[PDB]
């Protein structure tokens, strides 16, 4: 139950940290993998849910494995290939390899699917999918905050607008932060709604009906962390900015 939740100190001594990857660098490695998953997922025409599952798989995997031994660019496709099966939107092995290839090498050209080098990149993915399952100890059922965002934003009667900003905050928390490794989905959902309210100057305590542990002290600490990375992310905030 606390297997896949870590303290801030556990996050400092991550497997990657052990092979000399800076904290900051390790986040980049994580954020970059989330982008690759998001890009591949859109092209493969899977749901955001499926993409999200794969992102959580990836986050958890690197609490056990090191980026210095497993690159995001290898793990992302395998995580996504797996998450699509798990979430009942199976994409074919060749198809996932083909799309991964175009994302990672826009200018390259797919090898002859008969070549030994291609038969091999197929084999590598399958091997990596297998390692993910074992690293995650076959725990594949992910709970995502999106379920809960919908919940709060109705049970506080937010405009479609407010609700949409909350989903956006929620999605971005997965790409940009390791919250999914520290807080349960219901708390993260409270964080996203809180910042969305702040961002739209809406005022509705509401969160006590959502999670008994949650405090305003915590909500403000977390929205601040999240707002900062959002401010550091080019064009990301433009998407929710009221331009009128």
């Amino acid at each position: 139950n606390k297997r896949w939740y870590f303290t801030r100190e556990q996050l400092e001594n991550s497997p990657s940290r052990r092979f000399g990857v800076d904290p900051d660098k390790e986040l980049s490695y994580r954020q970059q993998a989330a982008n690759l998953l998001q890009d591949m997922g859109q092209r493969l025409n899977v749901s955001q849910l499926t993409i999200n599952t794969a992102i959580v798989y990836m986050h958890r995997f690197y609490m056990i494995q090191s980026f210095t031994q497993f690159p995001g660019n290898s793990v992302a496709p395998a995580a996504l290939f797996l998450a699509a099966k798990v979430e009942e939107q199976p994409k074919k092995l060749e198809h996932v390899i083909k799309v991964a290839h175009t994302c990672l090498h826009p200018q390259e050209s797919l090898p002859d699917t008969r070549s030994e080098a291609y038969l091999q990149q197929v084999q590598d993915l399958v091997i990596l999918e297998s390692i993910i399952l074992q690293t995650l100890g076959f725990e594949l059922t992910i709970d995502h905050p999106h379920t809960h965002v919908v919940k709060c934003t109705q049970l506080v009667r937010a405009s479609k607008d407010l609700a949409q900003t909350s989903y956006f905050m929620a999605t971005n928390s997965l790409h940009l932060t390791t919250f999914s490794l520290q807080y349960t989905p219901p708390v993260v959902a409270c964080v996203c709604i809180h910042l969305a309210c702040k961002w739209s100057n809406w005022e509705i305590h509401w969160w006590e009906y959502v999670d008994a542990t949650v405090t305003l002290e915590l909500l403000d600490e977390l929205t601040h962390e999240l707002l900062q990375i959002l401010e550091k992310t080019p064009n990301r905030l433009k998407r929710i900015w009221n331009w009128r």
């Binding site: 797996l82 099966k85 199976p90 399952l133 059922t141």
Partner: protein
Amino acid sequence: VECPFCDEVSKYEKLAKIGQGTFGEVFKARHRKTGQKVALKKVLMENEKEGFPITALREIKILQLLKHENVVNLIEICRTSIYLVFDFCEHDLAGLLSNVLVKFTLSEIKRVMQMLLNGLYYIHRNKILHRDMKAANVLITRDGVLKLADFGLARAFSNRYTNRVVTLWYRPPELLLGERDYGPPIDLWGAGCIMAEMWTRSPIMQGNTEQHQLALISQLCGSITPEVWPNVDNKVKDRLKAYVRDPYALDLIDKLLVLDPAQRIDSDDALNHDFFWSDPMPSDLKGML
């Protein structure tokens, strides 16, 4: 490569194939330290062109969810291949029913059905269809506790579901009629067939093709009729009268084996049936074993 959460299956010592005759490669095995008996199910990989079988993923996903006295217990998953490890159960309804030395009292039959209906009520309550109800998939532990097993065709529900489901002899009218918008009632039809099997000691309806099953079903439940089964088009008690005799048992069997799925009894009402609430009351499984 580190692996904190997937143990090597070598922790268990293989005792006996039990067996390939049961849909696949299941071994009885022994924890090397404690002697605890388990069942090892290998994840088969012939003609697995798409990595780790999506089917292993569902069953693992499902078993991890279903935690109940009447559902088989998944302990952990092991590597070396990959194995699902279950708490071992000595008997299975099919073995017991095909063994002339085994004898159930009316009191004990009630209990077997009670555990079965309760397992079904639970799995359905969790939005899962077993989709493979049959005597050989019902286990009973050394201590007389019944467990539903073999969730390899099971799937969550909430429709265009797959029609290649349920062993032929236990398959309900809906499916044989090509229905793809079905629900929990399909498991209950199989529950009907297993119940009747508790006396007849042999599957009431042994078809050879899909149509041979449908003819047989009709020679028992009346015929498929828009009066009996509204919108379908798109002697139960006499034949069982011999074996069963008890009024109450016969009536429930009639309500489980109902043609119209929406008029077919569900797990909640069946548990309530007077059969479980009149004498002889359901009793533990001791002397049966």
